[PDB]
Design a protein around this nucleic acid. Structure first.
Lengths: 150, 56, 117, 142, 110, 46
RNA sequence: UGUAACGGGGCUAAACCAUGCACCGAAGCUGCGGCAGCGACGCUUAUGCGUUGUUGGGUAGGGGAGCGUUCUGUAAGCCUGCGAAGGUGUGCUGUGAGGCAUGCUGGAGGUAUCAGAAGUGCGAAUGCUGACAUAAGUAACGAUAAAGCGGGUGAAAAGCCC
RNA sequence: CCCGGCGAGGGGAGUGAAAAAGAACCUGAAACCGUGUACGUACAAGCAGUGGGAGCACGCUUAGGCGUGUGACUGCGUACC
């Protein structure tokens, strides 16, 4: 802290309490005995665990009947109107999208929507799954998963 | 000096009992002008016992 | 993250003072005092609930011992005659009789003397 | 329930008299304090005064056992310099006999307002006459 | 009736002022002015000026009726205390308080 | 725009804190130094 | 310093000895009710129990189970301008830190649940900051060279002008 | 407009959803200070309380009690770290 290392006043011969500095925490304007530093909060996760956990939840999705599988799934052109219009026929609101390969013609119209996220197999994370009440996959896309774990 | 410990508010409230004011509770009326004035003291206009003096 | 305590301290203090309502002077106002006044008040309670049962049972006896003598006998011997006559009545109800109903108590005393004879 | 307790309004007091001639001092006052305190009645409430008015008479005729007449002492202090005064039982009778009975009872009674109260009940005289007849003294002896 | 009046940020100690107030409570109006006038304090002039206004603050703003009138609620509550120094020996200063007293007057027929 | 004078009470404040801490701190043993004579007698080193 | 070497009254027994029967008197024991810990029991079978007994003062200290504030995700969800938070009381409630509704204000935010990270819970530390009591309307108004009076001003004059 | 010293401060009127938004101007707590009302207090000795406990005054009600405030008198009891 900005300040001066001088004793704020004399050691003895006074009615106040012994003080060696103005920068101490019991004092106003400067303090914080223990101060934080931008330390890294990340954790390590054993591979097989991460690879072993995804096995579970997927199994847990089927038993919830939340997971869904379909054949080739894409929009014709980049329009949220068309995209959502395809889900409203499927009775879907909050959903996830995962496919083995992305068509840039799609990911545009999926952007603007608050209730949707689109992903590629290499880009999935556990939390995204649990979040959305429904999930989809492409049999192709599925092949990359079971092939991934092995 | 050095009060060893502090008195109450009730205490000093008693100390200030006799400190209260006493009202005059008496006045007069001029023998002529009918003005209000103290006993033995002149009226603002100067009339004392019906007599005019100062005329200021 | 940082925390500000301006509030739940009021809660504590306000609570306490409420329990300190009625006490004299600084004890009903400041927290730094009332805190040790209430904590002391409680341990009179824990102390008092014990001994009140002493206070009444030394009262109830005093009630009785008079009326006995008023009937011409002393507390001690009066009891023992009952314990020989097999009467379990408590001292509470007994004393209550001597205040309201003199008859039973009077009519009762002859019992002891009878058996105690 | 809540056990009964006496109330000043509902109190019923009474008058009594004693002739102290031939009596033993200590053994007399204890009974006098028993009455005034109310422990002889059924309704006794320790924070109330249920005692009955008492009137002693002919206190100077009182007697004591042994040599205490020329021995027993009274002491009182004036709040001055440390100065102390003492008076024998003999003296006190020849001067203020009413004090004697009026003292011994006090030491046998509680301190505080109440003990001062029931003390107001008592009336002593060194003579055989009293002017309190109007309240009547239904007689008592012991 | 109502039509109160008040003086605020006066320079005086409520203690002092509080002596005059006791001399008038529940009293008839006219007496006070006669009492205050021949009373001697720095406050009597001060407080009187207020009381003079409450009345005048009435008849113009409400039903008047002075000859039957009374002082019901008067009180004093301290105001700010200004901070000043009077120095002393050895170099020590001292914080002295210029104390101020708000005033309130309630004058009514009842 | 419609401000109340200027209240300089804070001036006498900062002067009081400054004045009070100055002496009270650096005055050192002046009360005691003076007391020192007293200090040489009131002590009773035995 | 003042009875003063029975606690005091007061006591020739209301003292000492011997003998005996009652009675009083603790939070001790028992009686009624309730909570929790421990062990065996056979069912149960992370559980009802049946019980059966037993335990439950406690500093330094060790172990176990917990209340509640902020922030984050769950939450573009829930409540809310027919009133949040905050403040101020009442009534209920829990074994405890505490929890719930509501009366008055205030005028816009709070957040269920479940997990996570804490600058996380105050009476002190001749503690720091600011505000306010005290002694107290007491001491003091700063050289003992000295003021008095009439007119004027003005709301007011001893202290301003003549 | 009035008081007020052709002041301060204030009260009316009025604006404004709200002057419990008036410049010191969102909220407005505590210590501290006061006014107001019920009860108690001038024969009464001591951590100031608790336990009991009248009487008094209230709000309920039911009709007999229940509650709130005070607290006369009494046993016990020498604060915190």
């Amino acid at each position: 802290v900005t300040g001066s290392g001088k004793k704020p006043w004399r050691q003895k011969g006074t009615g106040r309490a012994r003080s060696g500095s103005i920068k101490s925490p019991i004092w106003r304007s400067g303090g914080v005995t223990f101060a934080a530093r931008p330390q890294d909060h990340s954790q390590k996760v054993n591979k097989k665990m991460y690879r072993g956990a995804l096995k579970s939840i997927l199994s847990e999705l089927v038993r919830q009947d939340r997971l869904i599988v379909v054949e080739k799934f894409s929009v014709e052109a980049p329009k949220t109107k068309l995209l959502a219009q395809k889900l409203k026929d499927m009775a879907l609101e909050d959903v996830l999208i995962i496919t083995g390969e992305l068509d840039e013609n799609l990911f545009l119209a999926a952007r603007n929507l608050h209730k949707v996220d689109v992903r590629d197999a290499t880009g999935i994370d556990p939390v995204s799954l649990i979040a959305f009440d429904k999930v989809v996959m492409t049999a192709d896309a599925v092949k990359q998963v079971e092939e991934m774990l092995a | 000096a050095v009060q060893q410990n502090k008195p109450t508010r009730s205490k000093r409230g008693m100390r200030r009992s006799h400190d209260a004011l006493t009202a005059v509770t008496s006045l007069s009326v001029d023998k002529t002008s009918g003005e209000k004035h103290l006993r033995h003291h002149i009226t603002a206009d100067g009339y004392y016992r019906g007599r005019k003096v100062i005329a200021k | 993250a940082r925390v500000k305590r301006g509030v739940i301290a009021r809660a504590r203090h306000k609570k306490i003072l409420k329990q300190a309502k009625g006490y004299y002077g600084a004890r009903s106002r400041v927290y730094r005092v009332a805190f040790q006044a209430v904590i002391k008040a409680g341990q009179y309670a824990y102390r008092d609930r014990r001994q009140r049962k002493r206070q009444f049972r030394q009262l109830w006896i005093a009630r009785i011992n008079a009326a006995a003598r008023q009937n011409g006998i002393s507390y001690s011997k009066f009891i023992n005659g009952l314990k020989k006559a097999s009467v379990e009545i408590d001292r509470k109800i007994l004393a209550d009789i001597a205040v309201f109903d003199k008859v039973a108590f009077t009519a009762l005393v002859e019992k002891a003397k009878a058996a105690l004879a | 329930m809540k056990t009964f307790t006496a109330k000043p309004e509902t109190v019923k007091r009474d008058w009594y008299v004693v002739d102290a001639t031939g009596k033993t001092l200590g053994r007399l006052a204890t009974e006098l304090a028993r009455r005034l305190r109310g422990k002889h009645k059924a309704e006794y409430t320790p924070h109330v005064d249920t005692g009955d008015y008492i009137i002693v008479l002919n206190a100077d005729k009182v007697a004591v056992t042994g040599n205490k007449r020329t021995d027993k002492v009274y002491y009182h202090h004036t709040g001055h310099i440390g100065g102390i005064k003492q008076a024998t039982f003999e003296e006190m009778i020849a001067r203020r006999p009413e004090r004697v009975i009026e003292i011994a009872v006090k030491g046998m009674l509680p301190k505080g307002p109440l003990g001062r109260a029931m003390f107001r009940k008592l009336k002593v005289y060194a003579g055989n006459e009293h002017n309190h007849a109007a309240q009547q003294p239904q007689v008592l002896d012991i | 009736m109502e039509t109160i009046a008040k003086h605020r940020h006066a320079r005086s100690s409520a203690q002092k002022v509080r002596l005059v107030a006791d001399l008038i409570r529940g009293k008839k109006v006219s007496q006070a002015l006669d009492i205050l006038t021949y009373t001697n304090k720095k406050a009597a002039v001060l407080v009187k000026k207020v009381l003079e206004s409450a009345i005048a603050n009435a008849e113009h703003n409400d039903g008047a009726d002075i000859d039957d009138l009374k002082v019901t609620k008067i009180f004093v509550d301290e105001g700010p205390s200004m901070k000043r120094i009077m120095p002393r020996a050895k170099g020590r200063a001292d914080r002295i308080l210029k104390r101020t007293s708000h005033i309130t007057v309630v004058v009514s027929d009842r | 725009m419609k401000f109340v004078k200027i209240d300089s009470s804070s001036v006498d404040m900062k002067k009081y804190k400054l004045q009070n801490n100055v002496r009270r701190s650096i005055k050192s043993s002046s009360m005691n130094y003076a007391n020192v004579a007293i200090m040489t007698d009131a002590d009773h080193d035995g």
